Design an enzyme around this catalytic site. Structure first.
Site, short mmCIF file in Angstrom:
data_model
loop_
_atom_site.label_atom_id
_atom_site.label_comp_id
_atom_site.label_asym_id
_atom_site.label_seq_id
_atom_site.Cartn_x
_atom_site.Cartn_y
_atom_site.Cartn_z
N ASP A 44 1.04 -1.29 -0.16
CA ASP A 44 0.10 -0.24 0.25
C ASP A 44 0.88 1.08 -0.71
O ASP A 44 1.79 1.57 0.86
CB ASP A 44 -0.96 0.28 1.31
CG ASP A 44 -1.74 1.00 0.89
OD1 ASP A 44 -1.71 2.29 1.41
OD2 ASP A 44 -2.93 0.93 0.15
N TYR A 49 2.89 9.95 -1.02
CA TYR A 49 4.29 9.05 -0.58
C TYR A 49 5.83 8.85 -0.32
O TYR A 49 6.94 9.14 0.60
CB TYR A 49 4.49 7.89 0.60
CG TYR A 49 2.56 7.20 0.75
CD1 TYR A 49 2.31 8.00 1.59
CD2 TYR A 49 2.54 5.98 1.11
CE1 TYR A 49 0.60 8.49 1.89
CE2 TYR A 49 0.45 5.35 1.53
CZ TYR A 49 1.03 6.71 1.98
OH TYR A 49 -0.48 6.16 3.06
N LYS A 74 -2.94 5.76 -4.89
CA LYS A 74 -3.84 6.48 -4.28
C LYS A 74 -3.68 8.48 -5.40
O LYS A 74 -2.67 8.82 -5.54
CB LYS A 74 -3.73 7.31 -3.43
CG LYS A 74 -3.82 5.61 -2.11
CD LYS A 74 -4.29 6.13 -0.37
CE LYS A 74 -3.97 4.86 0.70
NZ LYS A 74 -2.50 4.49 0.46
N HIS A 107 -7.42 9.30 -2.53
CA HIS A 107 -6.97 10.16 -0.74
C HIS A 107 -8.00 10.39 -0.04
O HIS A 107 -8.16 9.65 1.36
CB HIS A 107 -5.07 10.11 -1.40
CG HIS A 107 -4.86 10.10 -0.11
ND1 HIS A 107 -3.30 9.74 -0.32
CD2 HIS A 107 -5.12 9.07 1.60
CE1 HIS A 107 -2.63 9.38 0.76
NE2 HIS A 107 -3.86 9.40 1.74
N1 NDP Z 1 -5.66 6.22 2.91
C1 NDP Z 1 -5.01 7.03 4.23
O1 NDP Z 1 -5.50 7.75 4.28
C2 NDP Z 1 -3.86 6.17 4.78
C3 NDP Z 1 -3.36 5.10 4.81
N2 NDP Z 1 -2.31 4.23 5.73
C4 NDP Z 1 -1.56 3.23 4.98
O2 NDP Z 1 -1.92 2.70 6.21
C5 NDP Z 1 -0.94 1.91 7.16
C6 NDP Z 1 -0.33 1.63 7.99
O3 NDP Z 1 -0.58 2.83 9.02
P1 NDP Z 1 0.32 3.20 10.49
O4 NDP Z 1 0.35 4.78 9.77
O5 NDP Z 1 1.90 3.36 9.13
O6 NDP Z 1 0.82 2.72 11.13
P2 NDP Z 1 0.58 1.81 12.42
O7 NDP Z 1 -0.41 2.14 12.79
O8 NDP Z 1 -0.21 0.27 11.29
O9 NDP Z 1 1.58 1.70 12.49
C7 NDP Z 1 2.66 1.77 12.34
C8 NDP Z 1 4.41 1.92 13.69
O10 NDP Z 1 3.83 1.09 14.61
C9 NDP Z 1 5.21 -0.05 13.89
N3 NDP Z 1 5.28 -1.01 14.19
C10 NDP Z 1 4.79 -2.08 13.20
N4 NDP Z 1 4.63 -3.37 13.93
C11 NDP Z 1 4.87 -3.37 15.37
C12 NDP Z 1 5.01 -4.58 16.25
N5 NDP Z 1 4.80 -5.15 15.92
N6 NDP Z 1 4.94 -3.61 17.65
C13 NDP Z 1 5.79 -2.53 17.74
N7 NDP Z 1 5.25 -1.25 16.29
C14 NDP Z 1 4.64 -1.76 15.36
C15 NDP Z 1 6.21 0.79 13.42
O11 NDP Z 1 7.51 0.36 13.99
P3 NDP Z 1 9.09 0.48 13.42
O12 NDP Z 1 8.45 1.04 11.51
O13 NDP Z 1 10.26 1.14 13.33
O14 NDP Z 1 8.02 -0.94 13.66
C16 NDP Z 1 6.01 2.11 13.50
O15 NDP Z 1 6.35 2.76 14.15
C17 NDP Z 1 0.27 3.09 6.42
O16 NDP Z 1 1.92 2.36 6.27
C18 NDP Z 1 -0.23 3.50 5.27
O17 NDP Z 1 0.54 2.44 3.59
C19 NDP Z 1 -1.72 5.23 6.65
C20 NDP Z 1 -2.26 6.89 6.79
C21 NDP Z 1 -3.39 6.83 5.89
#
Ligand code: NDP
Length: 277
Positions: A44, A49, A74, A107
Site C-alpha cells: 500500500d 508518499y 492513491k 486519498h
Molecule cells: N489512506 C490513508 O489515509 C492512510 C493510509 N495509511 C496506510 O496504512 C499504513 C499503516 O498505518 P501506519 O500509519 O503506518 O500506522 P501503523 O498503525 O501500522 O503503525 C506503524 C508504527 O508501529 C510500529 N510497528 C509495526 N508493527 C509493530 C509491532 N509489531 N510492534 C511495535 N511497533 C510496530 C512501526 O514501527 P517500526 O516501523 O519502527 O517497526 C511504526 O512506528 C500506512 O503505512 C499506509 O500504507 C496510513 C495513513 C493514512
C-alpha cells in the site's frame, strides 16, 4: 498464509499487506524487498508518499510474477479537478513501472473543495481505461459515500479509513457492510500514538494465546473482516506481524477490545476528513 477477500467487482485482495507510509523514499526499495522476501504480497503506497519508485524497483528486483502481487496507490488532493485524475495515475504508473495497479483510491474527500463526486466520475473512467483493476476511496464519510454512489451508480470496492480499537468509525463499517464495500484499516496499530499494547483487553488476549500484543490487534482487525497493512521498518516485526493466521481470539475477547472505543470520537489519532483540504 494470508487469505484473500473477494471485492464487489470480482477482484481478490490479500487480507494482510504491507504499508509504506513513513518509509523514506531512499530506503523504500530495501524495505519492500524485505517484505516481499518475508512473505508479503499486498503493498500500500501513495503518490504523496513519494516512494512509488522504490516500490516499483523492489517489485522488479524480486522474482515474483505480477499476478501474485497486489499494488494499491492513491490519488492526491490536488488532483481531483478536470482530468487531473488521468494525469495523476499515469505518473504513478510510470513511477511504479507497471502496466496497471490493482487498486486505486481517492486519498481524501476534501469536502470544502466540493470535488469528490467529480473525482469519483473520473475514477470510473480510469478503471474502464484499464489503468487500474479496481477503484475505491479513502477517508470518505457516509454522506460522501451515498452521494458518489447516487451520482454514479458505481459502488466503491473499498473504503480505507483510520481504524483501531480506540476509534472504530462504526457508522462507516456498518454502512460498508450493508453495501458490500470492504474496509481497509489504516493506522491499525494506533500509529504508535498511544499505549495500545498496554491495553488490558489487549494484554489479556495476547497472553491467552501466547501471541504479542501487536499480533492480538491484527487478529482483531482480521477477524472483524478488515484488510490491514501495518507498517514497520524492522524485519522482526514484518515477521511477527505476518504470523497471525495461527490463533483466533474469542467472542468475549473481541468484545473486550471493541469496548475500548469510548464512542465520543475521542480515540482518534489522525486527521478527520472535515479538516483535510
Ligand atoms: N489512506 C490513508 O489515509 C492512510 C493510509 N495509511 C496506510 O496504512 C499504513 C499503516 O498505518 P501506519 O500509519 O503506518 O500506522 P501503523 O498503525 O501500522 O503503525 C506503524 C508504527 O508501529 C510500529 N510497528 C509495526 N508493527 C509493530 C509491532 N509489531 N510492534 C511495535 N511497533 C510496530 C512501526 O514501527 P517500526 O516501523 O519502527 O517497526 C511504526 O512506528 C500506512 O503505512 C499506509 O500504507 C496510513 C495513513 C493514512
Amino acid at each position: 498464509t494470508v487469505p484473500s477477500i473477494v471485492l464487489n467487482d470480482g477482484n481478490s485482495i490479500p487480507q494482510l499487506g504491507y504499508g509504506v507510509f513513513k518509509v523514506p523514499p531512499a530506503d523504500t526499495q530495501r524495505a519492500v524487498e524485505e517484505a516481499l522476501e518475508v512473505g508479503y504480497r499486498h503493498i500500500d503506497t501513495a503518490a504523496i508518499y513519494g516512494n512509488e519508485e522504490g516500490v516499483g524497483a523492489a517489485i522488479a528486483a524480486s522474482g515474483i510474477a505480477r499476478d501474485d502481487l497486489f499494488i494499491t496507490t492513491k490519488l492526491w488532493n490536488d488532483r481531483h479537478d478536470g482530468d487531473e485524475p488521468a494525469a495523476a495515475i499515469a505518473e504513478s504508473l510510470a513511477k511504479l513501472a507497471l502496466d496497471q495497479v490493482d487498486l486505486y483510491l481517492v486519498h481524501w474527500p476534501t469536502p470544502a473543495a466540493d470535488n469528490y463526486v467529480h473525482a469519483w466520475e473520473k475514477m470510473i473512467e480510469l478503471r474502464a481505461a484499464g489503468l487500474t483493476r479496481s477503484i475505491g476511496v479513502s477517508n470518505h464519510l457516509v454522506p460522501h459515500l451515498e452521494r458518489i454512489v447516487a451520482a454514479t451508480g458505481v459502488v466503491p470496492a473499498v473504503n480505507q479509513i483510520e481504524l483501531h480499537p480506540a476509534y472504530q468509525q462504526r457508522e462507516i463499517t456498518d454502512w460498508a457492510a450493508a453495501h458490500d464495500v470492504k474496509i481497509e484499516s489504516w493506522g491499525p496499530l494506533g500509529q504508535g500514538k498511544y499505549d495500545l499494547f498496554g491495553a488490558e483487553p489487549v494484554t489479556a488476549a495476547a497472553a491467552a494465546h501466547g501471541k504479542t500484543p501487536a499480533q492480538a490487534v491484527l487478529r482483531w482487525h482480521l477477524q472483524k473482516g478488515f484488510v490491514v497493512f501495518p507498517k514497520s521498518v524492522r524485519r522482526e516485526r514484518l515477521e511477527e506481524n505476518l504470523d497471525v493466521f495461527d490463533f483466533d481470539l474469542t467472542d468475549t475477547e473481541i468484545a473486550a477490545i471493541d469496548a475500548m472505543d469510548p464512542g465520543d470520537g475521542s480515540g482518534r489519532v489522525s486527521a478527520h476528513p472535515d479538516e483535510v483540504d
